[PDB]
Amino acid sequence: TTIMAVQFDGGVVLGADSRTTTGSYIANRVTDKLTPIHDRIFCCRSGSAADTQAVADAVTYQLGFHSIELNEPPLVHTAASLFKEMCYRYREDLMAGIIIAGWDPQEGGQVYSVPMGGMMVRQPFAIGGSGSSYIYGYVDATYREGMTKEECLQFTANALALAMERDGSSGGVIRLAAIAEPGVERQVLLGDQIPKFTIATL
Amino acid sequence: MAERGYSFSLTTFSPSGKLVQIEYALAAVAGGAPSVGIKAANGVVLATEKKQKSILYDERSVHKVEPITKHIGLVYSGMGPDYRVLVHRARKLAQQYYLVYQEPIPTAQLVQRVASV
Amino acid sequence: SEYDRGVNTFSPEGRLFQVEYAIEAIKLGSTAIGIQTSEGVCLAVEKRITSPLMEPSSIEKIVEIDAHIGCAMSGLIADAKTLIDKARVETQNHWFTYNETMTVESVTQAVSNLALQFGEEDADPGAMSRPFGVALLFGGVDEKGPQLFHMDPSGTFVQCDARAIGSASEGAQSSLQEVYHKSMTLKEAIKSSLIILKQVMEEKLNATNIELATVQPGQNFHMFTKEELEEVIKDI
Amino acid sequence: TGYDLSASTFSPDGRVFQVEYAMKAVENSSTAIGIRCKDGVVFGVEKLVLSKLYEEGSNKRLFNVDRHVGMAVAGLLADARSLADIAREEASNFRSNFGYNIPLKHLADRVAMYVHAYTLYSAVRPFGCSFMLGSYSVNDGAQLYMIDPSGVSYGYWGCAIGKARQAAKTEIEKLQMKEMTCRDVVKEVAKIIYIVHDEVKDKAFELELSWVGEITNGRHEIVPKDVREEAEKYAKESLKE
Amino acid sequence: TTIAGVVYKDGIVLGADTRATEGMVVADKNCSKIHFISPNIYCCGAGTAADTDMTTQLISSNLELHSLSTGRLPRVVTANRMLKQMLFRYQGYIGAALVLGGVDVTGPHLYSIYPHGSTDKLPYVTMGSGSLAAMAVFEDKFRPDMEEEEAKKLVSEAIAAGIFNDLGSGSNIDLCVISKSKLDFLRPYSVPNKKGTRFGRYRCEKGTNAVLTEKVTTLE
Amino acid sequence: TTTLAFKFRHGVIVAADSRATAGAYIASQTVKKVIEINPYLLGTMAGGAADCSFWERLLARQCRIYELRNKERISVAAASKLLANMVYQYKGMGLSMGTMICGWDKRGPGLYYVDSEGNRISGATFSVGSGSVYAYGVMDRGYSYDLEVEEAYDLARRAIYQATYRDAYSGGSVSLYHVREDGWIRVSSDNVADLHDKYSG
Amino acid sequence: NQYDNDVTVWSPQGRIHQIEYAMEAVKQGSATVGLKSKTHAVLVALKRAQSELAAHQKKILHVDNHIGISIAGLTADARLLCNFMRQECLDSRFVFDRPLPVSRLVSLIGSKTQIPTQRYGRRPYGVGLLIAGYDDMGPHIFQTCPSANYFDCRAMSIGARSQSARTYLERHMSEFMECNLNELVKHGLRALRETLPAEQDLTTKNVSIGIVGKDLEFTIYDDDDVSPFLEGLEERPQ
Amino acid sequence: RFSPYAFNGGTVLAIAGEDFSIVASDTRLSEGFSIHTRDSPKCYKLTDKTVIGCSGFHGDCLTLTKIIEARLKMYKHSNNKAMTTGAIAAMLSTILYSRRFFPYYVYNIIGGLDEEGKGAVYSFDPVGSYQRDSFKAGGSASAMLQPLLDNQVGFKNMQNVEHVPLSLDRAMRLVKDVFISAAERDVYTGDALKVCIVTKEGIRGETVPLRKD
Amino acid sequence: TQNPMVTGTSVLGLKFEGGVVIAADMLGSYGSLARFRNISRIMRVNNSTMLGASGDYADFQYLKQVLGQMVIDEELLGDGHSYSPKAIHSWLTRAMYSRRSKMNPLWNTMVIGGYADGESFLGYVDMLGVAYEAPSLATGYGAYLAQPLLREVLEKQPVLSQTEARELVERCMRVLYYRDARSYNRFQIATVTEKGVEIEGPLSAETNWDIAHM
Amino acid sequence: GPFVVGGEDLDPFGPRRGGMIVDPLRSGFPRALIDPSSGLPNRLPPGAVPPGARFDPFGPIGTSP
């Protein structure tokens, strides 16, 4: 699993691979690891599939009730706080690393990382999963401030492609989501749409 | 706010030995809409009247004749919301019986359980 | 008529009705007298035998709370049983925890903390539904010397030099006021207590009509035998 | 007869008389007022001095429910203190759960639901107090809410609760609070409090003033002593002619 | 055990083998591994068989209550949510893994549910010890929007591969075809395996067994 | 630790050593391993000192409450049963107690062995502790129901002395108690060195 | 009537009669006086004896090294409240290793005493307390009521015939602040004596004094420690 | 895993005289091979006549001292008098046994005056087994100091020696010397020696420096 | 917490005449990986108290939330009483001991610095409930690498000025960067004085690498 | 673990262990538990240091590879 969220001026760009494994067997090669928590809030799930699914369902339920009560669009910080509270209260029982990314009228695009253990930090960009280790240097050397939405999409696609090439638990297709004020735009990169890097030979 | 209820019976015996709350519930039933049931040789028919006080009501939204199982049906006379509560409880009891014995509940057993409630 | 009010309603005068009714119930009990001197404490209670077929030795209106503490009770003795058991358990618990004897004041305080623990709502099963109907006279000897304490179902407890409880507590207290003085000896206290009991009792005072116990410095709780009672009642 | 002994019993007319009696108890208390302006909310309480032996500031009827929320109460003071504790707990729990300061409307709704929970059963008694909630934030602006013993909560521009609230409402209606600032609103509140107080009926009172707004940087606090003295002088000079 | 299912152009086809083993010994040669949930929803089971039976029965009862209350046809998403929440709150102690398929107002839906409480919504799923052979068949031959007969043939081929390449699978092939207009519970659908015909006879005759005592009780 | 008790015609003789060890280190040589529960009841310490002391103090509290309620002293059998029922509730939790309950009641001299494992047996002679085997041998060689009082004292002292001689966890001084019909008496407390001088010399 | 038997029943006048009856219970007790200077807080209590052969009832209790109280009303309720306050102070010293502020303790007392006044089957605490404490804010005199309301007082008197004591405290409040310990105790004793009939005089048997200050822990002077404070008191002015 | 215990060093010594009691300890707090702080005395004043010394797991020592203080205040409130040394010892025994299955890793020595005015010393094991002694060493250097106290205070293994009653000055000198030897040979003992002297005139504290290596 | 996930390295404390100074790097490590390089491990408790923590960062965030709520409540009372650094230290000790006694410890070692009533406070609390005060503090690897230097300076000069204390803290940070593999060269320095709590950062230490040519 | 008591004080042979008095320091409490490999780039083989032999740690506690 490799997940990635990057913040640009108007919003955020989310990305994930689609491989779910039971050992070395790929049980689901078209998995959708980008979960919409609200209209403009998504989450990236890594770790135990059951734990992440249950936590995402519970946070969706709580955030929907909270937004209905307040008659106001929810904050990305509020969704991150709910995820953090649930993941910290049950840190011994859950195995869930979450990335919460979304757009706010009051705060704009926001990326929050909630790793295993239950800490919460806002970042310009976040990467998670077993395949994120292989792309730390790439995102460190490639990220720059002021990137547009298209540049953020290309950056996320490149990093995900490299991680999928190197990581055995990552692969399949690249699912991208761009969230801004107008709405959420989703796309799937597959086949030759995935960025290609030539293998060095001889 | 206190979630405790009253722990004393509201139905008690009278000097003549009668439970007058049960008689008043029976009067409430007797003031309800007519209901008829007829056991034929090859089946049973349950019939009742449902005349709304106005044409603004939706006749197709609320049903006085209700199924409990695939082989048991219900109809009432008296207070509608009480009937809804008893229908829910009867369905739950029948489903519990099916969960235990894996065969549909006989009519007599369901009647006994609802009467116990 | 008796269920119009709860057990915890105040009167317009600022008094709980049930506590006042228990105070009234006390006045139906047999008279008990406690006198505290520098030489010890003496307790005397009228047994009030109803039938000659009854065995007076089965009436226990004076009990031993501990080796250094005694209790005289008036009112509803069956209500006093649980309070006496609580006092004994408290003394034993204090000995277990601190390897020492309780003071009479602390025992009386522990018993009095149970007086108002009654009520219908917000109560565990088995809780008291009403106040107790007993007045307790606690007499004992501790490091502060002999001491006498009085307790009533209001939860109040005070130190007393000499006090009487029961049906004839008014006339006995007036008699106690005259006879008592600070320099009184234990023998004088016992004689005056028996004289007042004889004055207030309907029947003639004898070795079976009364109980008498003493606690003295250096000596445990001691209930008088029939021969000792006969000796004391010889000349009054 | 007997329809007014329990909050779980309706009257034949369809009324809950225990709630009305609690509101009557509220109507017997001294008057506290609150005015919302374009940049904050100002609270003013006519705190009666029942005994000269009491310390200044005793039985204060202004509370800090949160860093940004203030509370002005009227009625039974013990019930008001319990409701202030409830509001404080609600705000603390909201911050613990969702990670940010509770909106004033949401807090008012929660406390109003808690109050309404006491108007339904015979096991409990309706609260004998009514109170106002004031707050200010950059995103939400100035907000002012009032909760009555029945549990009804409404937003207000100017609110008065207590013995003389109709006269206080008449005095408040003469104010163009939608364009005023907290500095002028403090003096206006002081003048209204001095106007509605009854010197013949009540021996003396203290003027308790508090505010929340941009001048306090979104914090609810007691109005500073200088501004309070200026407002009291202005109120006294306005009473005189 | 080999259980498989596909989404075809108009519904759901579920498949299963009918062999149940206890260790390395075949205990049942005709075991029904496709479980009724609702008139439009069925389920294939794997894992602890008692856990699967009880979980499917409980969810079927709850769905029946829900449909009685609402008066509408049950949804596959409701069954999936109930199953996954119940499985998650037991933290995998209920070792039931299920292939859930059905057709509702939204169309045909297929789910795979795991004992820890994680679900996947896929056009074709396999489960059991023979799941990899059936998955190979699916990845080799599956195409979207197949017809009912083509889907039945594909599921039968997958189950046959599981039967003939896994020691835990065998016997017959059972098919459940679900569409918005009909439901086909084909048991058996194929019989690829049969007992060999006898080459001789065993000795088993009357009086061969010695009896110590005999008691006969006449039932009126 | 070596504690012994035996019944004879003049009551119950209770003897014990006084050495407490922590591993291979002697923490104390002056431990009162005979617990004076009451003026009529005695107990012994073997195993955990804290466990034995705490539970026999609880037994003393229970016996005092029983005497206050019933206006009669508890019996040896009842006290031993009370202690056994008290310690059985914590069986398997790590309590290590071996005790002897000795006294005189309406049935005569009483002597029960109660351990944390749940045993409760009445007997004539008992020996508990790590040095109990040596004391058992000496006592059995020298025991008789018709012993004189001084002979019983000498037998108990000699058995405890031999046990301390052979056991590394036994030593200090020998505390001797005699349970009679009108309560027990503390007979003596002789140091092991003095006993060595008396016996070897 | 029908509104005076339950604490959960409002009256048509917006009043609860059980609370007023508990206030009457407070008014039934013997008078006690609390007053404070810049550095000390003093409680003087007029003890009462059931009989000539009975010791005078305790009226001043130890709560903590910096807090003491004087009671008036139901004694068992007073003991319950004192135990609650002692537990709160012990918890404060255990968790924060600092004395609990007096105002926060009084707030806790009010919160605890408000609950029984709103639940069916409970009754108001029939005791009123005068609380003397010293903390970082200095000396404090507090008064609690069965109505669960509490007051911060410069001086206060509760119990029977406390109106005369309150009048005297009103008269001399202007000079209460700058008095030293002996002068403050004499002022309190005069206020307490104002509650006594002419034939009755303050003696070492019926006077209890509790003092807390900056460098002085809470101490109770009962029988022979009272004589230095009694000495110097002039005769009753009549 | 997780260990709820740690050894923080510290030696506690108490000697009971005819009219005095001395409680002494080092002021070094450590963990493993490191020194937490050089000023952490193990002696706590309980009453005007009782001083307790606690060594072992320092968190348990802090909790136990606070609990003892709270219980002493509770006793003073309930009984209108201060606890005696024997009452404190019995109460501490009960408190220690209350955690029998999760013990306080504390070595406790109580030193003070009894009801007759004589010095009293009580030594406690972590689960509450206690007895009255005349002298006792507890902590990391207890095995080093106990035989020397037996030889010098108890006059053990000595002949033709009069058992002169122990005086305050001789006891103070002996305590200082034994702690100097302990600081020589024990790695947990050093950086100071704090001595509390309990007499009928109050409690007097004294500080003596030790080597810091 | 049984297994800490994201942890912080050593935190240093030092008293000077006029207040206390506390330093901690801005790195949260996921095992050996330097994963979060811009986190703050120093919190301001109130106007007179600051806190720095090592160990599990999620537990530190939980404790920060609870302590902030406590401070908010106490300021809501508005009665003139505020928690002292010693009171915060005692509450932290009680909380850590309570967590340890339930076998659910807060995997943290915290340094409490404060200045109230003209006297500096420096307090140490660990996950087991062991607490003490000292003129200088250093957790984790700083207990071996930073504490000896602070102790040496305090033995030569018991009382330090603010400038000397900050210089010594910077030297200790440089040594920790040299010798600790879980440390980072981006740290914060927090000071508490009579003027309040002031947190400065991010700061870097000047490093010498001329022994690479030897 | 080290809080064992009474096992060896009641029976010379048997699974239970411990004396009459609880003392963790006398019942194998780790005291300062240091890995023999602390301060080394590699872990030491099992049994490298015989018990009872004078050993000097290669580094402080916490430097184990």
- Nearest by CB: J22 against F1, F19, F50: F50
Q: Residues of F at the annotated binding site? A: 49
Task: Please tell me which residue of chain I has the smallest CA distance to D97.
Answer: I65
Residues β-bridged to residue D209: D44
The distance from CA G160 to its chain's CA centroid, rounded to whole angstroms, is 13
Query: CA A187, A193, A194 angle in degrees (round to 5)?
Result: 95
Residue H147 preceded by cis peptide, ω within 30: no
Residues in J closer than 8 angstroms to I141, CB to CB, are 62
Structural domain for E50, as ranges: 3-190
Report d(CA D132, CA I179) in Å as an integer: 60
Other residues' Cβ atoms within 10 Å of the Cβ of residue F82:
18
Number of domains in chain E: 1
Chain H (26-55) residues lying within 8 Å, Cβ to Cβ, of chain I? 29, 31, 34, 36-37, 39-40
Nearest to H200 by CA among H80, H119, H121: H119
Return the structure tokens found at E86: 């119940």
The distance from CA C20 to its chain's CA centroid, rounded to whole angstroms, is 19
Residues β-bridged to residue G130: G70, G143
Structural domain for A157, as ranges: 1-202
Residues in J closer than 8 angstroms to I144, CB to CB, are 60, 62
Question: Under DSSP, is residue F182 helix (H, G, I), strand (E, B) or coil?
Answer: coil
Report d(CA F111, CA F42) in Å as an integer: 10
Amino acid symbol at F79:
A
Number of domains in chain G: 1
Report d(CA B111, CA C59) in Å as an integer: 61
Report d(CA I140, CA H31) in Å as an integer: 12
Report d(CA C65, CA C43) in Å as an integer: 13
- Nearest by CB: H33 against J3, J23, J60: J60
DSSP C30-42: PPEEEEEETTEEE
I83 interfaces chain G, CB cutoff of 8 Å: yes
Nearest to A3 by CA among A92, A128, A110, A154: A128
Number of domains in chain A: 1
Tokens 């010379």, located at residue: J12
Return the structure tokens found at D189: 């509140």
Q: Any residues with CB less than 8 A from the CB of D237 and at least 6 apart, and which?
A: none
Q: How far is I30 from chain G (nearest CA, A)?
A: 34
| Contact: F69, C85; criterion CB under 8 Å | yes
Nearest to H177 by CA among H148, H134, H138: H148
Q: Output H205-209 pairs: Cβ under 8 A, ≥24 positions apart.
A: H205/H43, H206/H172, H208/H176, H208/H179
The distance from CA A148 to its chain's CA centroid, rounded to whole angstroms, is 18
Question: Under DSSP, is residue C43 helix (H, G, I), strand (E, B) or coil?
Answer: strand
Report d(CA H8, CA H31) in Å as an integer: 5
The answer to whether residue E139 is domain-embedded is yes
Report d(CA J6, CA F116) in Å as an integer: 11
Report d(CA J26, CA J19) in Å as an integer: 10
| Contact: D99, A66; criterion CB under 8 Å | no
Q: Can you state the angle between helices F132-142 and F149-166, rounded to 10 degrees?
A: 150
- The burial of A164, by beta-carbon neighbours within 10 Å (0-12 exposed, 13-18 middle, 19 or more buried), is given as buried
Beta-sheet strands, E only, within chain E: 3-8, 11-17, 20-22, 25-28, 34-38, 41-47, 96-104, 107-113, 119-121, 124-127, 173-179, 183-190
Domain range list for chain H: 1-213
Q: What share of chain D is helix, strand, coil (3-state, %, to 5)?
A: 35, 25, 40
Resolution given for this structure, in angstroms? 2.5
Q: Any residues with CB less than 8 A from the CB of C29 and at least 6 apart, and which?
A: C74, C75, C76, C134, C135, C165, C166, C167
Q: How far is J21 from chain H (nearest CA, A)?
A: 7
D9 interfaces chain B, CB cutoff of 8 Å: no
Q: Are E43 and E99 in contact (CB under 8 A)?
A: yes
Q: Any residues with CB less than 8 A from the CB of C2 and at least 6 apart, and which?
A: none
Other residues' Cβ atoms within 10 Å of the Cβ of residue B3:
6
I76 interfaces chain D, CB cutoff of 8 Å: yes
Residues β-bridged to residue G209: G44, G221
DSSP chain H: ----------EEEEEE-SS-EEEEEE--EEETTEEEES----EEE-SSSEEEEEEESHHHHHHHHHHHHHHHHHHHHHHSSPPPHHHHHHHHHHHHHTTTTS---EEEEEEEE-TTS-EEEEEE-TTS-EEEESEEEEETTHHHHHHHHHHHTS-TT--S---PPPPHHHHHHHHHHHHHHHHHH-SS--S-EEEEEEETTEEEEEEE-----
Report d(CA B20, CA B18) in Å as an integer: 6
Report d(CA C90, CA C96) in Å as an integer: 10
CATH superfamily of domain region C10-233: Aminohydrolase, N-terminal nucleophile (Ntn) domain (3.60.20.10)
Residues in I closer than 8 angstroms to D66, CB to CB, are 72, 76
Q: Any residues with CB less than 8 A from the CB of A171 and at least 6 apart, and which?
A: A17, A18, A19, A26, A29, A164
Report d(CA F61, CA F51) in Å as an integer: 15
Relative to beta strand G150-153, strand G155-158 is unpaired
Nearest to E53 by CA among E35, E77, E41: E35
Q: Could you write out the three-class secondary structure of chain G?
A: CCCCCCCCCCCCCCCCHHHHHHHHHHHHCCCEEEEECCCEEEEEEECCCCCCCECCCCCEEECCCCEEEEEEECHHHHHHHHHHHHHHHHHHHHHHCCCCCHHHHHHHHHHHHHHHHCECCCCCCCEEEEEEEEECCEEEEEEECCCCCEEEECEEEECCCHHHHHHHHHHHHHHHCCCCHHHHHHHHHHHHHCCCCCCCCCCCCCEEEEEEECCCCCEEECCCCCHHHHCCCCCCCC
Structural domain for D32, as ranges: 1-241
- The burial of E94, by beta-carbon neighbours within 10 Å (0-12 exposed, 13-18 middle, 19 or more buried), is given as buried
Residues β-bridged to residue H14: H23, H136
Residues of I that are catalytic: 1
Say if I and D touch: at least 3 Cβ pairs within 8 Å.
yes
| Element spanning I35, H or E | strand I33-36
Q: Could you write out the three-class secondary structure of H61-120?
A: HHHHHHHHHHHHHHHHHHHCCCCCHHHHHHHHHHHHHCCCCCCCCEEEEEEEECCCCCEE
G-H C-beta contacts closer than 8 Å: 11
In angstroms, the Cα distances linking F174 to F190, F199, F200 are 5, 14, 16
| Element spanning F192, H or E | helix F192-200
Other residues' Cβ atoms within 10 Å of the Cβ of residue J58:
16
Residues in D closer than 8 angstroms to A100, CB to CB, are none
| Contact: C96, F69; criterion CB under 8 Å | no
Residue I193 backbone phi and psi in degrees, to 5: -140, -165
Report d(CA G60, CA G57) in Å as an integer: 10
Alpha helices in I79-202 (DSSP H): 85-101, 142-145, 147-156, 162-179
In angstroms, the Cα distances linking I201 to A108, E23, I16, J41 are 26, 66, 20, 34
Amino acid symbol at H162:
E
I-J C-beta contacts closer than 8 Å: 3
Q: Are D182 and D215 in contact (CB under 8 A)?
A: yes
Report d(CA H56, CA G219) in Å as an integer: 37
Other residues' Cβ atoms within 10 Å of the Cβ of residue H206:
14
Query: CA F12, F17, F18 angle in degrees (round to 5)?
Result: 130
Nearest to E162 by CA among E127, E187, E191: E127
- Nearest by CB: E68 against B91, B98, B102: B91
What b/e string do you get for A91-101 counting C-beta neighbours within 10 Å, with b at 16 or more?
beebebbbbbb
| Contact: I83, G135; criterion CB under 8 Å | no
Task: Please tell me which residue of chain D has the smallest CA distance to G166.
Answer: D53
| Contact: E57, B102; criterion CB under 8 Å | yes
Number of domains in chain D: 1
The answer to whether residue E40 is domain-embedded is yes
Q: How far is D97 from chain B (nearest CA, A)?
A: 24
Say if B and H touch: at least 3 Cβ pairs within 8 Å.
no
Amino acid symbol at F86:
M
Query: CA H153, F19, H93 angle in degrees (round to 5)?
Result: 85
Task: Please tell me which residue of chain E has the smallest CA distance to A48.
Answer: E118
Nearest to I57 by CA among I169, I175, I182, I199: I182
Say if F and D touch: at least 3 Cβ pairs within 8 Å.
no
Q: Any residues with CB less than 8 A from the CB of G32 and at least 6 apart, and which?
A: G43, G44, G45, G46, G59, G60, G70, G71, G72, G130, G157, G158, G159, G192
